Amino acid sequence: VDPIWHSIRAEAEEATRNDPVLGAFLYATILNQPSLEEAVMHRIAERLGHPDVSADILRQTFDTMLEANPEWSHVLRVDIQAVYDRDPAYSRFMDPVLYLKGFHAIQTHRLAHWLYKQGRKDFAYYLQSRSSSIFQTDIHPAARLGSGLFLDHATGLVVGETAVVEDNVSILHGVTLGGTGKSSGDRHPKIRQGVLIGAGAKILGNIQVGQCSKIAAGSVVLKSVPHNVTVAGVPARIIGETGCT
Amino acid sequence: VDPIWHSIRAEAEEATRNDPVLGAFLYATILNQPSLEEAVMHRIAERLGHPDVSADILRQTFDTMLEANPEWSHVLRVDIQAVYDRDPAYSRFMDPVLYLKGFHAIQTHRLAHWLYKQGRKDFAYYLQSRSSSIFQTDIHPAARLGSGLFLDHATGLVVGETAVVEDNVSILHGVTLGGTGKSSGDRHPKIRQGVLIGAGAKILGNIQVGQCSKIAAGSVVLKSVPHNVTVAGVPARIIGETGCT
Amino acid sequence: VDPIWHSIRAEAEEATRNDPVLGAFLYATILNQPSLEEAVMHRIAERLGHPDVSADILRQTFDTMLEANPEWSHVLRVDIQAVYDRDPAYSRFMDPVLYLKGFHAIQTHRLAHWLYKQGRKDFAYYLQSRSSSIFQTDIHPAARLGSGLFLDHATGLVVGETAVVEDNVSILHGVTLGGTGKSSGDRHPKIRQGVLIGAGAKILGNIQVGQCSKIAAGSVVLKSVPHNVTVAGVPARIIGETGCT
Amino acid sequence: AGLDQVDPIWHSIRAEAEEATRNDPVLGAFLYATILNQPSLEEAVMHRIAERLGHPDVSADILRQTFDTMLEANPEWSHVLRVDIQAVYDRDPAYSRFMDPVLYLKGFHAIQTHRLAHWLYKQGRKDFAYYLQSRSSSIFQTDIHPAARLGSGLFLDHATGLVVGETAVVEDNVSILHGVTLGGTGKSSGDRHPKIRQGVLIGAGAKILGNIQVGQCSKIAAGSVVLKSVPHNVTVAGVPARIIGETGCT
Amino acid sequence: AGLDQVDPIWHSIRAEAEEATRNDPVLGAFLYATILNQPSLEEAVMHRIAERLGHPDVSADILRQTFDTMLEANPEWSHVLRVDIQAVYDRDPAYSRFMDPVLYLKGFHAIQTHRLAHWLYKQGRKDFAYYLQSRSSSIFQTDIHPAARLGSGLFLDHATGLVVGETAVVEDNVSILHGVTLGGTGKSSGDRHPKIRQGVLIGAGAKILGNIQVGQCSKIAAGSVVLKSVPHNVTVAGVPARIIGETGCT
Amino acid sequence: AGLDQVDPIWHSIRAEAEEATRNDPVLGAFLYATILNQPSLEEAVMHRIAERLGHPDVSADILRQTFDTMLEANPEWSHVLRVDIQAVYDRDPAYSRFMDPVLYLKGFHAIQTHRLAHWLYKQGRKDFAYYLQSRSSSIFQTDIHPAARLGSGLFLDHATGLVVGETAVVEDNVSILHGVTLGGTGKSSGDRHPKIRQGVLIGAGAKILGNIQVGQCSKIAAGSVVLKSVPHNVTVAGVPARIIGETGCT
Ligand SMILES: CC(C)(COP(=O)(O)OP(=O)(O)OC[C@H]1O[C@@H](n2cnc3c(N)ncnc32)[C@H](O)[C@@H]1OP(=O)(O)O)[C@@H](O)C(=O)NCCC(=O)NCCS
Ligand SMILES: CC(C)(COP(=O)(O)OP(=O)(O)OC[C@H]1O[C@@H](n2cnc3c(N)ncnc32)[C@H](O)[C@@H]1OP(=O)(O)O)[C@@H](O)C(=O)NCCC(=O)NCCS
Ligand SMILES: CC(C)(COP(=O)(O)OP(=O)(O)OC[C@H]1O[C@@H](n2cnc3c(N)ncnc32)[C@H](O)[C@@H]1OP(=O)(O)O)[C@@H](O)C(=O)NCCC(=O)NCCS
Ligand SMILES: [Mg+2]
Ligand SMILES: [Mg+2]
Ligand SMILES: [Mg+2]
Ligand SMILES: [Mg+2]
Ligand SMILES: [Mg+2]
Ligand SMILES: [Mg+2]
């Protein structure tokens, strides 16, 4: 089975019957695709395509990335699953695939990151630049993002060159994972597993946010945060202990 | 009479004489249009059009919404009037129509909201997604927005599924009307009449901001705000009493 | 010599050999151009072009601006130099030219500002509107920006009509240079030389930020800031003395 | 229940478009945006043609808005386009649907594009008219001077390579194939292109040259070069053309 | 090292495309996206053709995905397109490369577009088929009815102005020039367009009209009008056409 | 006040474009971006042609930048394009303005596109050249081999269906109509296409086939098939062509 894919295809078929004028959109992006992988790469290439660099070139490059990284099949699905499990506003597997710029931005970064590591720096920067303009997510291609990442609303996200985000993290819009100013080498946050980072929060410097911690909306976080705590405020203070899942 | 429309047409004619290369823009969007309604729907369809879903399809759908909601004629004009009366930076009725993504985003939501209520969920999400990418306004289609809404600068606005904004409200860029985390059902703010919400403010949870209240730039608002007060800070505190108009 | 230009051409040639599919991008924008000026105006016109107003019309208008302002040759280069000297994340003169929406937004404003002063108000607003949508930078065309301006990440920048930014300033994303509310005439900040303004900061009213001062990420600045100090917090407080360069 | 509520051409086209969408849903954007969302056949035809001619140089929208202006000034276009559609339906065995010319056949799209251009030209909007002529020549391969006069119930079958000069006149119920020139001898000044009478068929690749008349109900065989006026009710063939027989109308 | 690993046509095309890019790097986006990034000649041809026919009305993507469906259902298309490419290579002195038809020659693009349309038409997808016919008529200037039957090793040289009727049959190894009509007399109902046998050459501007046969290995001189069946192994010329001599194949 | 400051063609075009905009302001984007914002006629012509040929496959910009390179290497193009414009103005009654070929007439756009392609081909940039030939065939319906040689003061009237072979030569002051082939007999190897001398007029649909010469000032009637060299100062007509009379130049 591939239950995420089969659900997505059933939803697209229903969506098309319900609203025929969207048939070109839904067949080109889901129903004529032979796999979820090709559906996701297609949508993102179409959103990022421009006269400067066609959707085709983007999609063909994405194909080469998938070929080199079969593990992306798994990561992709855990990422879709993170949306489904963590966002009450949408009730379909199809929604992140078609609609959610946060989800698109994560996979775009995975592409840009892979290119950057191949020494295809320009392609990597081009995708960073286009993602920054169209998804409003400025993620440096050398950043490292884990799987099961949930990028909710996303607008205004900034992630620096040396930032690391571990698995099962949720990140709101307006979040900066950035540097302080005395910044040469390793200068951006390391975000551990199961963290939630609320809207507008700034996490600055080579500091750590410990496992399962929550950063309240609007915090400015300048010192490392221990595991299992809630921080809030400008500057941030521990305001509680917290759990995971 | 229709003084907003007649002023807009006189401005466009003058603008065209003054700068002929913009004649195609100004005739296609204003001067060849038989009404303000068709001018507004045209501009917004053109800004939102994409290979995925043409400007035409968007404009035709907008036409069906107007046909089903003749009250939008009135709402549209009070919305234009809110810009004219509340923003010193522009002195023309034409400016919101042509230029102001906040104004475009409000009417886009009105379209998406109507579609959502018709059971055209995908179209609704598609427009939410496109508005989030192009206008940087992420408004859930189930949100409810009153008339005489002023969306100034707009970039980064987020409005949740169960948020309600009442009439004659002004909202700056960077504003979140969102949820806290213990969020099942009704979980997003209710904004009463005549409120001003300043840049970067986050209003979180199923809480109310009372009539004529002001939220200072950068506030994190976690508790309901009574009528006629100014709140400021992280977290927000009452810092004064205030009036309307 | 023109060492910035010659370095940019050598980088583009190398980039093209390294990744041939980007040859159309890199030749159209750099290598077939006879000057850095024409390269910069071309990239920005291509990013801002739309069915509403073609990249060609934008580029031709840009040409007229350069012809009227030969000083832009110098300003452009000091602006590129500000990126090179102040951002560790990129190591090429070519990077701002091709990729950095902040850099594109600054020159876009310089164009819009010049048009505004010519009485080509609509063109000016059109470019403000398009820059606000594509670069997420909302800069009123009557704003005044000095040279050696560094707009890092840029997303969500708002600059009001009467704001003045002097030379050698660095500005992060999420920054508002805006008004308080009792705002008739001169109502927006004046930013002096060598200032750094951190992510998310709001500077509100006709107040001054003195030379070489630093505004920490997330500050709400409501009172004028003296020279050579660091301010932080909501509301902002002096937290230190600081220097320039 | 006024007489103009009778419109079997539009209703069949709406039914055919919906059935097409069910059977091939990927075509739904095309068929809804061009037919099913339109409140009239006039608006569907204007939209189709506008989209075919649309270019970064002059948008489909500007073309469609200009078409709207033409219809408002020329109400008879509603009947003319219906008779032109009926011509295809009656005269071409290769297509079974009223929808076929509306969506597909560049001859039908060229005819209405000329009607638009012709109106614009008479209004003193000569650049708009030449622009349409230019775009029609490039996309429909039909180079029709905007001063040319074309009747109704015109069937432009296949159409590729059609040239019609400035002073040509084509009357009602004519059928014209691809590769046809209604042109000049090259040796006169004013009135200098052909006058085609009602009911004429002009075969593929025919050149008709000069201020000459093709008489009513006559037929021009494929590849004829026609240099002298043709009487009514004959077939001509050959290079140059000669009467090869007698013919009737309908 | 199965037999179908032998593919000198694809390998030469890959080499020619890479050499072209080195020599003229601004063409790198075109040549990589159309040839060098593709894992097969089939995918390059589908991509090229999809991009040429693509329009806001129906995207290149939808066309390319539909092409993919045709290849999956018609595996023989892999050999057919290779023989069609080999026809150009063998029969046109003006071009030296297998890559020339794949990228440039609208006759070759039209042939495969017809193959797609023909398959769709037989599947009951008649709107898709007419849409392709319509788009091919406008962009390649080749108006080929989707019910027409076209053999392999077809060379459509220059192509502009080609018209092929609904009941036409063209067999293998035919060469057809621009301005050619395989059409009707206008006076019959069912089977009514030409049957072209193997090895035939049809010269520029020829009209072949009626349910008539052009016999094997025969040649139709430029500008001929052909109204009667042509026996094998002759050349015909003239208006109307007459046997002017004897001819062999190859 | 050097001699090359005299440019009545450019100045009339600038005046005509501005007057057009006042009269029909919706055309302002087109006319300003193509004429009024340009600092030279060369730049207007390059821009117009680049925009017509532009495609996602190779942008108008790349085409315009490549045109710029051609002009820089071939300064005589400034005079050639002006004589080509003057040819239309002098030879076509249907248009009254120097601006008409620059904006509208695909024959004029094809000629300059060939000039670009021809230069590229001689530079070893054969893919670029074939790409332009391919795009011109599809958008202007003029299939001109880049190795063909075309003189100045060429008038390509209507143009649809033009085919010119690899070894064709056309000298100065020629007028050529639509449906014209300067092609091959199909039976030779090297030099194999026509040599057209100065002052020739070639009528619509004419096929001129072989390494044959059309003598100076001669005229080819519409629909002629020309298989033998034509002496100077005659008119030929027919299938095949025969001398039908005597003719002079101008
Ligand atoms: C001429 C036409 C109208 C019908 O012909 P008709 O009036 O029935 O005449 P007939 O077929 O009886 O032919 C009588 C004579 O005319 C000649 N003739 C007919 N069509 C001719 C043509 N196109 N060119 C030259 N001669 C022709 C015949 O050779 C015959 O000569 P003959 O008696 O010396 O042997 C038809 O054949 C034609 O060419 N029309 C155009 C159809 C077309 O373009 N279709 C394309 C479909 S895509
Ligand atoms: C007919 C053709 C196939 C070769 O001819 P062929 O079989 O060698 O015959 P010949 O050249 O020996 O000519 C013999 C007779 O036929 C005539 N003839 C040849 N081609 C003719 C044509 N197109 N039209 C009319 N008559 C023709 C000759 O005039 C000659 O008549 P005559 O003996 O009374 O003087 C060739 O000339 C042709 O026209 N084919 C099409 C090629 C084409 O379209 N090329 C375009 C390249 S872009
Ligand atoms: C031939 C042409 C140049 C002028 O002809 P001309 O030199 O003045 O010769 P005349 O008109 O005096 O005709 C003399 C003989 O030639 C014949 N003739 C002329 N043009 C002919 C043609 N196209 N085909 C066949 N025969 C032709 C006449 O029938 C006449 O024969 P006859 O004496 O046996 O009756 C002109 O008619 C022509 O066809 N040129 C092309 C114009 C064109 O293509 N225009 C299209 C405008 S869009
Ligand atoms: Mg449009
Ligand atoms: Mg004949
Ligand atoms: Mg595509
Ligand atoms: Mg012949
Ligand atoms: Mg361009
Ligand atoms: Mg003749």
List the beta strands (DSSP E) in chain C: 137-139, 144-145, 150-151, 157-159, 164-165, 170-171, 176-178, 190-191, 196-197, 202-204, 208-209, 214-215, 220-221, 229-232, 237-241
Contacting residues for E16 by C-beta, under 8 A, at least 6 apart? E97, E98, E99
From E136's Cα to the closest Cα of chain F, the distance in A is 10
Which tokens is F127 given? 């893919």
Which positions in chain C touch B25 (Cβ < 8 Å)? 52-53, 126
Neighbours of D195 (CB within 10 A): 19
DSSP string computed for D27-55:
GHHHHIIIIIT-SSHHHHHHHHHHHHH-B
The domain segmentation of chain C, as residue ranges, is 1-137, 138-245
**Nearest protein Cα to ligand 2, atom 43:** E203
Nearest atom of ligand 2 to the alpha carbon of E245: 7
Per DSSP bridges, beta strands C176-178 and D201-202 are unpaired
Rounded CA separation D142/D119 (Å):
18
Q: Which of C1, C29, C3 is nearest to C13 (CA)?
A: C29
**Closest ligand to residue E183's CA:** 1
Q: Three-state DSSP class for A62?
A: helix
- SS3 sequence, F215-227? CCCCEECCCCEEC
d(CA F229, CA F227): 7
Residue numbers in A near E33 (CB within 8 A): 54, 56-57, 60
Side chain identity at F113, as an amino acid letter?
T
Torsion over CA: F76, F78, F81, F86 (sign)? negative
Q: Report which of B38, B75, B77, B73 is spatially closest to residue B59, judged by C-alpha positions.
A: B38
Domain D1-142 classified CATH 1.10.3130.10? Answer: yes
Check if the beta carbon of residue E124 is closer than 8 Å to that of residue E147: no
Residue appearing with tokens 């084509």: D170
Contact E37 A27 (CB under 8 A): no
Class of domain B1-137: mainly alpha
Provide the CA E91 distance to its chain's centre, in angstroms.
14
* Closest of B128, E170, D229 to residue A98, by C-alpha: B128
Ligand closest to F244 (CA) is: 3
User: CA–CA separation, C26 vs C151, rounded Å?
Assistant: 23
Instruction: Encode F65-87 in three state secondary structure.
Output: HHHHHHHHHCCCHHHHHHHHHHH
As a whole number of angstroms, the distance between CA A160 and CA A207 comes to 13
* Set of chain F residues whose Cβ sits within 8 Å of the Cβ of B27: 25-26
- Cβ(F174)–Cβ(F151) below 8 Å: yes
Q: At CA A225, angle to CA A221 and CA A231, rounded to 5?
A: 65
The continuous run of DSSP H or E covering A239 comes out as strand A237-241
Separation of alpha carbons A91 and B227, rounded Å: 36
Alpha helices in chain E (DSSP H): 8-23, 28-31, 41-53, 60-73, 77-91, 99-103, 106-122, 126-139
Q: What are the φ/ψ torsions at residue A231 (nearest 5 degrees)?
A: -110, 150
Q: What are phi and psi of B17, to 5 degrees?
A: -55, -45
Residue of A nearest to E57 (CA): A24
Domain B138-245 fold is UDP N-Acetylglucosamine Acyltransferase; domain 1 (2.160.10)
Query: Cis omega before residue F240 (within 30°)?
Result: yes
Nearest CB neighbour to E131, from listed D104, D106, D158:
D104
Q: How many CB atoms lie within 10 A of CB C71?
A: 10
Nearest CA to ligand 1 atom 48: E183
Residue whose entry in the numeric block shows the structure tokens 């190591």: C91
Would you state the torsion angle of the CA atoms of residues C137, C142, C143, C145, taken in this order, to the nearest 10 degrees?
Answer: 100
Ligand nearest to the CA of F53: 8
How many A from CA of E58 to the centre of ligand 6?
Answer: 10
Q: How far apart are CA B224 and CA B206, in angstroms?
A: 8
Within chain D, residue ranges assigned H as helices are 8-23, 28-31, 41-53, 60-73, 77-91, 99-103, 106-122, 126-139
Chain A residues with CB under 8 Å of B143 CB are none
For residue D6 the two structure tokens come to 């009778």
Apex CA F18: angle with CA F15 and CA F23, to 5°?
Answer: 125
One-letter amino acid identity for F224?
Answer: S
Alpha carbons D224 and D194: distance in angstroms, whole number: 14
Strands D149-150 and D169-170: parallel
Give the integer Cα–Cα distance in Å for A39 and A29: 5
User: Do F27 and B32 count as a contact with CB atoms less than 8 A apart?
Assistant: no
Gap from CA of D219 to ligand 3 centroid (Å): 21
- Confirm or reject contact between F59 and chain A (CB < 8 A): yes
Q: Is E55 exposed, middle or buried (0-12, 13-18, 19+ CB in 10 A)?
A: middle
Amino acid at D98: F
For chain F, helix, strand, coil in percent to 5 are 45, 15, 40
Element (DSSP H or E) covering residue B241: strand B237-241
F244, F247, F249, best to mutate for ligand 3 pocket (most atoms within 8 Å of CB):
F244
Answer whether E60 contacts ligand 1 (Cβ < 6 A). Answer: no
**Residue B168 structure tokens:** 């004659």
Going by alpha carbons, the residue nearest to atom 16 of ligand 1 is D244
| C209 strand-pairing partners | C191, C225
Instruction: Tell the residue nearest (CA) to atom 41 of ligand 1.
Output: D203
Full 3-state SS string of B93-152: CHHHHHHCHHHHHHHHHHHHHHHHHHCCHHHHHHHHHHHHHHCCEEECCCCEECCCCEEC
Instruction: Give the residues across from A138 on adjacent strands.
Output: A158
Question: d(Cα C70, Cα E54) in Å, to the nearest integer?
Answer: 43
**For residues D135 and D151, what is the distance between their CA atoms, to the nearest angstrom?**
21
β-partners of residue C164 are C144, C190
CATH architecture of D143-250: 3 Solenoid (2.160)
Q: DSSP H helical segments within E54-171, as ranges?
A: 60-73, 77-91, 99-103, 106-122, 126-139
For residue F32, what are the contacts with CB-CB under 8 A and spacing of at least 6? B20, B21, C57, C60, F17, F21
Q: Kindly state if the Cβ of E240 falls inside 6 Å of ligand 1.
A: yes
Q: Which of B120, B109, B215, B108 is nearest to B171 (CA)?
A: B215
**Beta-bridge partner residues of A220:** A202
Mutation probe of ligand 3 site: the residue of D226, D227, D229, D239 with most atoms within 8 A of C-beta: D227
B170-171 and B196-197 as β-strands: parallel, antiparallel, unpaired? parallel
Pairwise CA distance, residues F30 & B12, whole Å: 18
List residues bridging with D246 in a β-sheet: D234
Provide the CB-side half-sphere exposure for E74 (13 A, CA): 21
**Is any Cβ of chain B less than 8 angstroms from the Cβ of C214?**
no
Cα separations in angstroms, E77 against E152, E154, F220: 9, 13, 44
| Dihedral angle, C-alpha D146, D148, D149, D155, nearest 10 ° | -90
Report how many Cβ contacts below 8 Å link chain B to chain D.
Answer: 31
The neighbour count for residue A171, using CB atoms within 10 Å, is 28
Resolution to 1 decimal, in Å? 1.9
Going by CA atoms, what residue is nearest to atom 2 of ligand 1? D221
Q: Where are the beta strands (DSSP E) in E104-227?
A: 143-144, 149-150, 155-157, 163-164, 169-170, 175-177, 181-183, 195-196, 201-202, 207-209, 213-214, 219-220, 225-226
**C-alpha span between E130 and E148 (Å, rounded):** 12
The C-alpha of A199 sits at a distance from chain B's nearest C-alpha, in angstroms, of 8
Range E144-148, long-range pairs (CB < 8 A, 24+ positions): E144/E110, E144/E114, E144/E117, E145/D94, E146/E114, E146/E117, E146/E118, E146/E120, E146/E121, E147/E118, E147/E121, E148/E114, E148/E118, E148/E182, E148/E193
